[PDB]
Amino acid sequence: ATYTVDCEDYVHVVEFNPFDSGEAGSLLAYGGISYVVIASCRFQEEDSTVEGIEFKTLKTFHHGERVVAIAWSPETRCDALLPLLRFATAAGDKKIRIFTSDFQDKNEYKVIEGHSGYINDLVFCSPEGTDIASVGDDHTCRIWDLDGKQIAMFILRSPGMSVAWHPEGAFKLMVAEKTGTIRFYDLTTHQAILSLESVQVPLMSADWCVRNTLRIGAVAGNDWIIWEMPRSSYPQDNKPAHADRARMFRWSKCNENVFATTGYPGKMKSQIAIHHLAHPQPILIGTAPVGSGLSWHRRLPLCVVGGYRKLFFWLTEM
């Protein structure tokens, strides 16, 4: 790893804030066994006054449960006039928790109940940050307001494994199902618009390319899979990602040809593989002893993976 930061406990999930918070540093959230930490990261590649990585814990939230997914709210700002931290979490208790903070003394959380199975993924699904989409082992995709009222529910054919909001198009939710189907839902009409099918199963994670909204990447079985819309429902590319089960797929936020994949946590060291579409092999192979969560920095060609009491950062040479 280019950089390494020590953590109090095991990192189960890690997510960079994909939004602009108005600070010079990039916000990072990571979930432990019973807590969520919010930190600021500054890198030597952004500021020549930083030697390597400046990592500052801003806030720690007691969760009481193992965090499985974290979603940032678009309303999240660190501006001194009206600081507002908002994020959602899913945990092993099948509940969603929305956290709100002013980075001072006001720390509130709301519990949302209604999933009957484990929640596998969640996102904010509105530009205004009012709505949360969640997917789980109850074979539902559910839409919630910040009041914890269910606005909508889509019945899935298998466990929902990943959910993502479309970066430019209003009302388009992507839902990846474990059996290899990726569906798109319109949240205005409450209808499925389209599906894609993976050649391999189980489908474990899918992400939108923010730089090219026609591209979707995923991991299914051992392979990474790319689709280009609207050209075909069939994959454009399908290549090996890992020797034993791929787990997470995330697109780089700065490059439309770069993405990271993670292997399944197990008896082998979890490998991170960074791929470039022009290359038949990974451009970088990292090892994390046991790691969960994968996120990309908003501006830098830098990705983070959580591990045993550590965050590991890889810079990719562009």
Partner: peptide
């Protein structure tokens, strides 16, 4: 359960 914990590599 202990063997499963021993695999995934979660010693705590």
């Amino acid at each position: 359960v202990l063997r499963l914990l021993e695999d995934v590599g979660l010693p705590e």
